[PDB]
């Protein structure tokens, strides 16, 4: 816990981490998409299109 963080910062860092082996490669089949697009503006809820 870092002073001043929101509750979500922990979950968002977990989403970013991807393990000790993983990396921020950009050589993936996907191409380095953004992970926290909806967790930031809809922090709690979930929406389907």
């Amino acid at each position: 816990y870092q002073t001043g963080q929101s509750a979500q910062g922990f979950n968002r860092l977990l989403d970013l981490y991807g393990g000790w082996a993983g990396s921020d490669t950009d050589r993936n089949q996907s191409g380095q998409v953004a992970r926290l697009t909806n967790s930031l503006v809809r922090p709690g809820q979930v929406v389907e299109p």
């Binding site: 929101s6 509750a7 922990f10 979950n11 709690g44």
Partner: protein, 172 residues
């Protein structure tokens, strides 16, 4: 985050109009009776270590599960984390009490606690019970007519109760 003035202003703007004389009256009453709110917030802040101590004592007496070896509050490092979480949540209830709106709490504080504690495996039920214990141990500090001018503040007691209840119900 949003106090009550900012919240009423947002609701006015979404309808795209000036503030009604009725909401002006509501905010005037809030400002007149915010001195009592200052007193209640001071009561929570000065007496925070007592509230956390009482809630911790009754929680770990009620639940040996937390402090036994292999328990979730055992290893004397998870214990400091427990007391720190209690500190944080009581701090955020004090914020949402001074402000007047639960937006501070459920935005800056408790969107992600359920799944944070699920990711750490800690029992969220025990955290909700800890928050309820904080509430009970806090109201007794909050009603004290010692060294505070006497008056009626039942609305503020209901407000603090609903903030503690919101935190507990979200974490649970």
């Amino acid at each position: 985050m949003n106090d009550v003035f900012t919240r009423a202003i947002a609701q006015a703007d979404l309808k795209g109009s000036f503030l009604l004389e009725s909401d002006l009256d509501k905010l005037a009453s809030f400002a007149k009776e915010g001195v009592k709110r200052l007193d209640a917030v001071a009561a929570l802040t000065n007496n925070a270590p007592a509230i956390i101590s009482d809630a911790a004592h009754k929680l770990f007496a009620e639940q040996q599960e937390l402090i036994q070896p292999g328990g979730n509050a055992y290893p004397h490092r998870r214990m400091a984390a427990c007391l720190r979480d209690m500190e944080i949540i009581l701090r955020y209830v004090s914020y949402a009490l001074l402000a007047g709106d639960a937006s501070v709490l459920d935005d800056r504080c408790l969107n992600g606690l359920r799944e944070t504690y699920n990711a750490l495996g800690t029992p969220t039920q025990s955290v909700a019970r800890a928050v309820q214990l904080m509430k009970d141990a806090a109201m007794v500090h909050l009603k004290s007519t010692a060294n505070v001018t006497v008056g009626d503040c039942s609305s503020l007691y209901s407000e603090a109760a609903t903030y503690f209840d919101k935190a507990a119900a979200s974490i649970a």
